[PDB]
Amino acid sequence: WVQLGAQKVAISEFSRCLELLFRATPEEKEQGAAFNCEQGCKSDAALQQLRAAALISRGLEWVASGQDTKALQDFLLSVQMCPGNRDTYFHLLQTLKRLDRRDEATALWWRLEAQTLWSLPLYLESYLSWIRPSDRDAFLEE
């Protein structure tokens, strides 16, 4: 719906994704009820990175509408979620550099340099590589 141009039904679907990430658990293997996906769907990796994905996906639609406080909320959450993406920190820091750069930005700079792919499913790896900006490291060393 982003490619088609429909802000409404876009933010709809990002919100619906997020509700089934938090107001459900994917790891309820209490009851062996069927045949089921062992690997690709349970990985704590696939959870934290899928959260980050839809949070940034939605943050960009908030940026498009000019509600950059809501965008800041979703980006700040994805930072707490998966601190080893840097796509998250990139979008957050670009927003802080638009509005209120210094103290916030530097506080996250030092975090990144303090911080410094195991078995991610393919459609998700592929999706991240799709959305991520080329001018990433250039911005992060500024």
Dihedral angle of Cα 110, 49, 51, 135, to the nearest 10 degrees: 60
Contact of residue 18 among other proteins, Zn ion, none (CB under 5-8 Å per partner type): other proteins
Indicate the angle between helix axes 87-99 and 102-115, nearest 10 degrees: 160
- If binding is defined by CB under 8 A, does position 12 make contact with other proteins? yes
> Candidates 18-26, 35-43, 82-90, 106-114 — which segment interacts with other proteins by CB under 8 A?
18-26
How many amino acids of this chain bind other proteins (CB under 8 A)? 12
- If binding is defined by CB under 5 A, does position 37 make contact with Zn ion? yes
Which CB sits closer to Zn ion, 117 or 122? 122
- If binding is defined by CB under 8 A, does position 19 make contact with other proteins? yes
> Candidates 14-22, 41-49, 90-98, 110-118 — which segment interacts with other proteins by CB under 8 A?
14-22
Residue 38 CA to residue 33 CA, distance in Å, equals: 13
State residue 41 phi and psi, 5-degree precision. -100, -10
Residues that bind Zn ion (CB under 5 A): 37, 40-41
Residues that bind other proteins (CB under 8 A): 8, 11-12, 15-16, 18-19, 21-23, 73, 77
